[PDB]
């Protein structure tokens, strides 16, 4: 039976550790894929980590230049949360250098993009058999969430971008059923820029918080109806959510151009006019991670917030982060539990290795008590190479 | 319930990437079988890659001389599509240096040939228990498809050859039910030569496109009734399908002897008088791969075609290719989806290693949009040896 | 359906070997987690070994200083009994440097503690989704059983300590249902000290035998009602159960301070006024292991006992040990079968390696005949390092 | 539902290859257990290979002196037929240096013997939970089949020996239900000697062909009722079954002492007064293997036989062999299919390594055509050591 997405986000107080996979530490000896862009997504029965392999293993020569990003060897695979991604425990999903996936209550939808920069095509699979295809409509690196899509009442939604990461690009919302696109809409968002959206269901509607890699130090958002009727904006808070970014100060309801140029995938959870913001601790690089609660922060410019919970110390590398959700049909709860994962990137460009890969940690909503700490990657580089 | 094969091939426009296993890249460190002659076959629930191991692992001494072809250690094993074939994820099927397999909707039929060149015997298994046996009737390397057999209405069909690869040989069609041969027929095809057939069901009948390793640059075919009443011919198109082959030109409805001598396993899909042709890009060696659509190409000698889609660049090694199909009982479709796989051979004779092995890619039918690219093997040789 | 804990312990005569995992021997080449604090726990269908990984593999550099105890990379994972714990066969459970788990007949409850010494928090999961949380209430290394909790009539019970291991600390019993704490009680036990309790169900009540790491050479106990109404005491027998300890002699019904200072996790089974005692063979170090039956030994100070069964020779390293139970709903028996496991610690501080890890053995109750022997770890150190 | 053993052996003509695991070849690089005493046994759904590990991996130092035989680290494990036995695919069964196992239609019965030579004890498990125990009754290496037990109508039967392998010993038949011994009988067989019996069901009764390691070049047998009413004898044929043995000649209905001293585990199938005999090709050592059909050979002394099928060349090492059966409830047949496996021993004492281990091949009954060949181990020694 299909996931009803009619319920609202769970009220929460802080974040409880959910998983840590230690995949790079383990990979020093074990047979662990070099990966990046990991994300977690759940069905009504299980939780899985998806990731983009480099079609190679840690500490092997084929991991050379894995800083690259796009290649024909890149594949989307998945394994159970918290396990190191290995050829011996990973299920193959799709050939892809950009991806998304989600479960609608019946089976898995995977979205894997491969092909040339000037004509990439997204292959959609429902339960592993191809059900549809979406070709680049601007010939400029068709790309998608790098985190789970969102399902409501048996329809699933994702966001894709085609165009320069460097300026105005084209942004589309897709609605799909049984892995087939049944409707799409191009956002009319001049001066906005959406990339790598973290989307979640909430009371029958989808809310996406994304990355402005053009000129936004705060994060852009799109929420929409099951009919793809949408609204757009940026997060107003002066607690800036992107990286790089300026020191906290007076924010804006539109793209804060100061330091907004490059960005990193992130997420945020909206509760009334407040936001739970996940962000790096560093202002310049992808270091540290922290959760911040600014009530009156989705709509106001206060650079002030109520609660801060440490996730990774400023002294340790982080990377991407994204939302994922646990539905009542899995949980037994009367609401939709907000969770998030963090990618811990090791290797190039920040360190002197021939390779780049990521570990993951994740945390879940929770109304009971919690604590801040540092759960860093933990591997010691360089490797045997 | 048994696969009805009564449906016709799906109308398609191009080919969507389905899988890539990266098995040789992974096998540089991981515990991956050295294999060749991989192929994909599906049931009503799953898709699996079958392959002929060399009873050894990449980058280990026992992979020496794995160019050989036939030995007592060769075994037919299988794993889920897209995973690297490893002793930790592979199901054992049969002792074999030539093989076929297919699912009838109820359980797997595997066909594994082993024994001496002068008296090989094919062991047939239904659901893993031996159900029948077929002995070499010409004492000269009994051998079979190296790709999936074809099932219709609870009967499965394969093709076998016994005799010289070098000249006239003997060709048989087998009909089997629950893994027992219930009828067979020797083709009366003087001047023809069939090897390594790719067979698929279409509207209650089987169509096989094969390899002429005697004197055919174009590909031989055999289609037949559930009663083993058959027709034979070659593909007429001047877009020659085999490798080696001459440059495209005026073809023939019989064996084009020019350059036809050695050959490579291949496939083709027939749509009316048109063909989807999969072939190497190179004329002299197993390099590159491409899909070509020549309407009026199954029956005519036009060296002209309508559409070409790149699969592997001319700069990269390929190898065998074969058809595989996805039935409605797995797909939900109202037709039989055509797919294909390509074997990417690395090592000897083309490269300076002690071993030979293959990776795989696969693609599926699809009525939506697609793109050409190059999805090559990607390993860098030689290995630690 | 929920495990009824209403049955009594099975009458037994000795102990039959149940499992041995050889994980350190295997780990000399294979990909085996460096672990410690293993334990076994069963459901109505299966038995699993849980363990605290160090987020690293044997014989790899990341196994350096794994003597440490508490770190952010420590995780609680599980695999089927008797298998070497590996990233390829282990299920991830929780991020944790202290843990417990148990199955209530419906699904698994896992308890994983992580965070800073001064504010650790226990994350409770039911069927893998977080259901509750318990924060350190004394800011001094919140910690728990390192062996299975106990379930009766759909409620599960565990014991936790917070405070100095060195003196008076605080001890709590928790009652939980579907992974949520529904009642707790702080023991009023001045001069007592409880750590690393081995708890088991017996006739609808829980009995825990624990470790006095303050001033007890004999073992402390707590038994309690489903209402958390409890009784406390020590094991009276002059066959002292802890390590270190004095030579056997006249015991006491309260903490025997002579040599009682440091301790080791252990267990015991109570039958009327008799005890089955598992203990090291050595008086000074964690060497050897043996099962001893002192009837009139739970309540009397006799240093005399009826039966002794050798489990590990004095010549070989041992370590922790703990109880685990097999319920009638798994067994078909009319009683609750007592079993136990032993941790065989190799490496630092006793041996000259950079690492520390453990193997396990386990034995089951049994009314038929048995024998004593020595089933030691078996690895030969140091390793390649 | 329980396996009815009421059916008779299938009529057969020869032997079709069923499996080959290549475990030593693969083990040169992969993580493969060093093992010996492998055997195959089937349920109503699957076939598994059981084996006695040495608690160590090929090509690792812990494989030193694995010629030994009995140690506390020896464990009985299992994996699907044809796969290399590895810590990543093997199910743990029992701690054991001698073993048997079989499935009764409902679940697995495993028998694992461990402990000291002077008091070994067999642990019986049904579905993995201990159900009974059998202690050495002569204090001289209690030991059992090293091949599958036999099940009929929900009862399972095995044979054990206690005493000298060197002279008169004590032999017992055990009947068990749900893994509990419900009856046993000591054979009154002065001058006979039974070891390592291969037992199979046939028309509601069990037939065992065994090893006389005292003074028998021909093989001893015991057949018996479900009531443990038994008959004994030796195989009369002058085609001697054991190894070592004399050249074929005039045989005897009793122990043929010439060359009968040491022996090897073997099997034979009885069809009326004829036998299918599996034996080494060599007369002096465990080299080669072959199947021979002597009708009028179970009861007569003719050194003449009708059919011989080669299994392993005289030039290659063999070892133990044993029967295994496939019941109608798994097969769909109206009879009980005879199969057999062969252990291919590599290393000490015959070769210059520090270790000893075995590969396996297996073959099944079959009424269709077959061929003889040589399917040898294939590993090249010595290893990296
Ligand atoms: C192509 C622009 C895009 C968004 C800025 O770059 C992303 C940045 C990345 C990064 O900043 O870490 C790595 C992502 N894999 C890449 N996405 C793709 C499809 O290559
Ligand atoms: C024996 C002739 C046959 C068909 C030409 O050769 C095949 C060619 C092969 C090839 O051209 O790649 C490799 C196949 N493994 C081989 N088949 C067997 C059974 O050896
Ligand atoms: C913190 C006191 C506690 C009980 C004495 O120490 C335990 C002793 C240990 C030991 O004696 O082996 C190692 C355990 N990992 C440790 N537990 C934790 C959470 O650190
Ligand atoms: C102890 C006598 C017994 C039968 C002769 O020896 C067997 C011979 C063996 C052999 O001849 O190969 C190895 C077996 N593992 C061994 N069985 C045990 C329990 O040690």
């Amino acid at each position: 039976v299909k996931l009803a997405g009619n319920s609202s986000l769970c009220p929460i107080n802080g974040w409880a550790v959910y998983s840590k996979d230690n995949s790079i530490r383990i990979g020093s000896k074990g047979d662990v894929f070099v990966i990046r862009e990991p994300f977690i997504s759940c069905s009504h029965l299980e939780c899985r980590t998806f990731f983009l392999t480099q079609g190679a293993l840690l500490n092997d020569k084929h991991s050379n230049g894995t800083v690259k990003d796009r290649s024909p060897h890149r594949t989307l695979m998945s394994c159970p949360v918290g396990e190191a991604p290995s050829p011996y425990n990973s299920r193959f999903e799709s050939v892809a250098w950009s991806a998304s996936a989600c479960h609608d209550g019946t089976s898995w939808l995977t979205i894997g993009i491969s092909g040339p920069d000037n004509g990439a095509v997204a292959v959609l699979k429902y339960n592993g058999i191809i059900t549809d295809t979406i070709k680049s409509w601007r010939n400029n690196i068709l790309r998608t969430q790098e985190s789970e899509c969102a399902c409501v009442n048996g329809s699933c939604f994702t966001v894709m971008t085609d165009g320069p990461s460097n300026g105005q690009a084209s942004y589309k919302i897709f609605k799909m059923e049984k892995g087939k696109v049944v409707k799409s809409v191009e956002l009319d968002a001049p001066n906005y820029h959406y990339e790598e959206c973290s989307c979640y269901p909430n009371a029958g509607e989808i809310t996406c918080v994304c990355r402005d890699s053009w000129h936004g130090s705060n994060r852009p958002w799109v929420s929409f109806n099951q009919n793809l009727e949408y609204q757009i904006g940026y997060i107003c808070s002066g607690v800036f959510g992107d990286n790089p970014r300026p020191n906290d100060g007076t924010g804006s309801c539109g793209p804060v151009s100061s330091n907004g140029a490059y960005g990193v995938k992130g997420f945020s959870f909206k509760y009334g006019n407040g936001v739970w913001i996940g962000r790096t601790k560093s202002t310049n690089s992808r270091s540290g991670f922290e959760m911040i609660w600014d009530p009156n922060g989705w709509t106001e410019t206060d650079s002030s917030f109520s609660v801060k919970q440490d996730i990774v110390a400023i002294t340790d590398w982080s990377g991407y982060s994204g939302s994922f959700v646990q539905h009542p049909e899995l949980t037994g709860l009367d609401c939709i539990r907000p969770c998030f994962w963090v990618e811990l990137i090791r290797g190039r460009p920040k360190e002197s290795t021939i390779w780049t890969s990521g570990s993951s940690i994740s945390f879940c909503g929770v109304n009971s008590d919690t604590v801040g700490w540092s759960w860093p990657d933990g591997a010691e580089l360089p490797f045997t190479i």
Side-chain angles (χ1 to χ4, degrees), chain A:
Chain A
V1 173
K2 264 76 177 201
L3 262 36
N6 63 178
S7 175
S8 280
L9 287 189
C10 296
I12 64 170
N13 287 306
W15 305 86
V17 225
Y18 190 59
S19 85
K20 185 184 207 291
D21 61 17
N22 292 127
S23 45
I24 304 177
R25 279 168 61 86
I26 297 174
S28 180
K29 158 162 175 189
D31 295 338
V32 173
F33 281 117
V34 18
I35 72 155
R36 270 210 58 192
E37 304 85 24
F39 65 94
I40 299 184
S41 187
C42 305
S43 69
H44 57 306
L45 303 168
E46 68 169 332
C47 278
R48 304 188 62 85
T49 307
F50 291 79
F51 42 92
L52 294 183
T53 66
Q54 286 282 3
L57 300 189
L58 286 162
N59 225 349
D60 175 72
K61 68 183 191 175
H62 294 273
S63 78
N64 209 177
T66 38
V67 212
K68 58 183 171 180
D69 262 340
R70 299 182 301 284
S71 82
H73 309 117
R74 218 86 208 263
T75 65
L76 172 66
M77 305 187 76
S78 71
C79 71
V81 278
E83 300 177 25
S86 152
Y88 322 135
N89 74 329
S90 302
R91 184 211 286 158
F92 174 88
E93 305 287 358
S94 230
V95 180
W97 44 248
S98 178
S100 171
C102 53
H103 194 105
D104 67 355
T106 303
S107 25
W108 286 103
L109 164 70
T110 54
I111 299 171
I113 296 163
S114 197
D117 289 357
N118 66 10
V121 23
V123 178
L124 317 210
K125 298 189 190 183
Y126 194 70
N127 199 23
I129 78 201
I130 300 177
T131 43
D132 209 355
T133 267
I134 298 170
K135 39 166 162 291
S136 177
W137 66 93
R138 294 283 203 137
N139 305 336
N140 197 359
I141 317 180
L142 178 60
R143 54 201 177 264
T144 189
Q145 303 177 54
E146 328 291 17
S147 91
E148 68 165 14
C149 33
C151 291
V152 176
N153 191 23
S155 304
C156 293
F157 306 83
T158 187
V159 175
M160 304 195 190
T161 292
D162 199 344
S165 62
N166 207 5
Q168 265 292 358
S170 173
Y171 325 110
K172 286 196 193 190
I173 300 172
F174 295 86
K175 169 179 184 176
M176 33 215 177
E177 298 171 353
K178 300 183 185 173
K180 182 177 269 66
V181 180
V182 301
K183 188 169 189 171
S184 69
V185 164
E186 183 167 0
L187 297 194
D188 187 12
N191 203 48
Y192 287 27
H193 191 94
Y194 295 86
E195 231 131 9
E196 296 165 339
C197 282
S198 302
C199 302
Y200 67 83
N202 188 356
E205 296 187 11
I206 285 65
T207 296
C208 300
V209 179
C210 318
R211 161 196 186 169
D212 186 335
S213 62
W214 173 20
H215 57 24
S217 268
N218 54 327
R219 291 203 178 281
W221 61 261
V222 205
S223 47
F224 50 84
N225 189 13
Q226 277 164 67
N227 242 319
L228 267 29
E229 297 157 2
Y230 65 93
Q231 288 168 205
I232 61 179
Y234 282 66
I235 289 174
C236 295
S237 172
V239 178
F240 302 119
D242 210 353
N243 177 275
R245 63 169 180 275
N247 292 336
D248 289 357
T250 304
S252 182
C253 276
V256 170
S257 64
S258 170
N259 263 296
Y262 175 43
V264 73
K265 179 181 169 66
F267 71 98
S268 284
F269 289 108
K270 150 149 157 53
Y271 284 87
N273 293 323
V275 250
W276 268 109
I277 294 170
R279 71 177 186 172
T280 62
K281 271 158 147 36
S282 185
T283 254
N284 308 322
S285 63
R286 302 163 165 180
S287 307
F289 203 90
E290 70 192 7
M291 290 303 292
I292 293 176
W293 164 246
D294 189 341
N296 320 307
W298 182 268
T299 55
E300 306 300 328
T301 318
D302 68 72
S303 66
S304 69
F305 55 90
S306 297
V307 177
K308 171 206 224 66
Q309 177 181 174
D310 291 347
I311 269 47
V312 176
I314 329 159
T315 51
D316 294 295
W317 300 119
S318 49
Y320 277 23
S321 46
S323 66
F324 75 98
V325 124
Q326 287 181 345
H327 280 253
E329 21 278 288
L330 160 72
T331 271
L333 265 23
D334 65 0
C335 59
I336 290 176
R337 158 174 289 174
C339 297
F340 77 90
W341 51 260
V342 179
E343 175 203 31
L344 315 181
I345 300 176
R346 304 300 307 273
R348 265 158 73 217
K350 293 305 197 164
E351 319 177 81
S352 26
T353 61
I354 67 180
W355 54 274
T356 294
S357 200
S359 267
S360 71
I361 48 182
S362 69
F363 302 74
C364 267
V366 148
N367 226 350
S368 51
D369 224 328
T370 62
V371 293
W373 204 28
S374 176
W375 292 268
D377 170 68
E380 63 159 293
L381 321 199
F383 274 15
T384 321
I385 281 163

